Subunit: 120 residues, 4 copies
């Protein structure tokens, strides 16, 4: 009733974009010659993809809504997008794919934070 | 090497759109007064979301590509999209959400079939 | 280095048991004659399954560990297991499957809370 | 109606064990000094985890059962478990984690094949 439906739609779209960005980025870093130096990057992409996938699904459901569950899930997704954005940005100079993924992570972090702030 | 990269990108985009469409449609049918008549619809949406989520991830990875694995996953996703498209279309007259979801299912079925045809 | 490996293993096992319990319980309530009265139960089972699945995967990964990410994900999983345990317990008198699922939710809530408390 | 409920339960248990085994094995190979030689292994573990997760969910649902969907999902899971078992077995001598994971993959491949054989 107080919720911004536009911010909810933005969050769901960003979670799906960011899940796929991080799945692709984990795979792209796996195929880099410097893969041995990219292991935290790959791991954080895998976590970010898993949490964005779950968050998109939870936020897509309105039946028997529980703000406590939604808030806790958005907080988890904000936290991992923040971590994975920082990590991919550290490899921005190595490969465009990590620069691009850092942008996706930062965009989804913002969409989660904006929705979270408005749930009270 | 012989793969259509545009058809691969289309498949990944369609899997993510269709996963979310089916998650939302399962939830929408859950909230319908005639929910007791929509149980196969809700179940098939849940399967369709899970298989589209897995397929988008598998198709997003190029490292150590295996055509056997990719083909079998695309066949599963084509099969569930076909079934879930048929089921949601049965409720096209009841609610816009199922017509919309039927369109997403049929679109992703086609993207899986088009990519499958080109993998040999 | 400070982490309880036994509590970490318990959490991962409980997340996988609880994900499957809630997937089965969503489906079992969908097939109940009183399904119209079980819609919050089914929705909360779907969220609980999605978050337990993500949490099991995040907690299974040690490379480039980040306690902020792990803590936020465990908090989300504790919160949804608590909600889904409460909801399934409300239908304990209707069907053994919901009683059983309530027990699984409460067991995973405890395993998440116990691990969370020890991460500092 | 004709289905072996014991073989269905075995398949679901094996999918969840195998999903987690492959998630842990991807992470373990990520942390190996020879990670550059383990890239196909890590990728195949990621696919195997995603498909086992989806298969466990689909097989956990009985409402509006569709043998075509179930068969195609079990075929995908048998195919990726076979591929991931072969890949992890190649590193059986390098690390216990891959021998363990190879065993999980082979066990889940068998449970999928045994259930598939009985669905007609
Ligand atoms: Cu989101
Ligand atoms: Cu996200
Ligand atoms: Cu992402
Ligand atoms: Cu990348
Ligand atoms: Cu990357
Ligand atoms: Cu990276
Ligand atoms: Cu990365
Ligand atoms: Cu990421
Ligand atoms: Cu993410
Ligand atoms: Cu997200
Ligand atoms: Cu996120
Ligand atoms: Cu990242
Ligand atoms: Cu990258
Ligand atoms: Cu990256
Ligand atoms: Cu990213
Ligand atoms: Cu990334
Ligand atoms: Cu991310
Ligand atoms: Cu993200
Ligand atoms: Cu986000
Ligand atoms: Cu979000
Ligand atoms: Cu696709
Ligand atoms: Cu799809
Ligand atoms: Cu769909
Ligand atoms: Cu629906
Ligand atoms: Cu429906
Ligand atoms: Cu439906
Ligand atoms: Cu669907
Ligand atoms: Cu689908
Ligand atoms: Cu798909
Ligand atoms: Cu599909
Ligand atoms: Cu459907
Ligand atoms: Cu619908
Ligand atoms: Cu529908
Ligand atoms: Cu659909
Ligand atoms: Cu649908
Ligand atoms: Cu679908
Ligand atoms: Cu689909
Ligand atoms: Cu598709
Ligand atoms: Cu596809
Ligand atoms: Cu856990
Ligand atoms: Cu759990
Ligand atoms: Cu559960
Ligand atoms: Cu139940
Ligand atoms: Cu239930
Ligand atoms: Cu229930
Ligand atoms: Cu329930
Ligand atoms: Cu639950
Ligand atoms: Cu859960
Ligand atoms: Cu959990
Ligand atoms: Cu939980
Ligand atoms: Cu519950
Ligand atoms: Cu129940
Ligand atoms: Cu329940
Ligand atoms: Cu439960
Ligand atoms: Cu439950
Ligand atoms: Cu639960
Ligand atoms: Cu739980
Ligand atoms: Cu838990
Ligand atoms: Cu836990
Ligand atoms: Cu299985
Ligand atoms: Cu499996
Ligand atoms: Cu596995
Ligand atoms: Cu491994
Ligand atoms: Cu490996
Ligand atoms: Cu591996
Ligand atoms: Cu594997
Ligand atoms: Cu697997
Ligand atoms: Cu499986
Ligand atoms: Cu499998
Ligand atoms: Cu493997
Ligand atoms: Cu290994
Ligand atoms: Cu392995
Ligand atoms: Cu394995
Ligand atoms: Cu493995
Ligand atoms: Cu496997
Ligand atoms: Cu497996
Ligand atoms: Cu299996
Ligand atoms: Cu199986």
């Amino acid at each position: 009733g107080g919720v911004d439906r536009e911010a909810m739609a933005r969050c769901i779209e960003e979670c799906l974009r960011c899940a796929q960005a991080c799945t692709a980025c984990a795979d792209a870093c796996l195929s880099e010659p410097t893969v041995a130096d990219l292991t935290k990057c790959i791991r954080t992409d895998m976590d970010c993809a898993d949490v964005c996938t779950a968050t998109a699904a939870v936020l897509s459901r309105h039946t028997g809504y529980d703000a406590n569950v939604t808030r806790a899930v958005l907080q988890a997704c904000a936290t991992v997008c923040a971590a994975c954005g920082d990590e991919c940005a550290r490899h921005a100079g190595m490969a465009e794919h990590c620069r691009v993924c850092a942008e996706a992570c930062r965009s989804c972090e913002q969409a989660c934070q904006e929705l979270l702030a408005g749930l009270g």
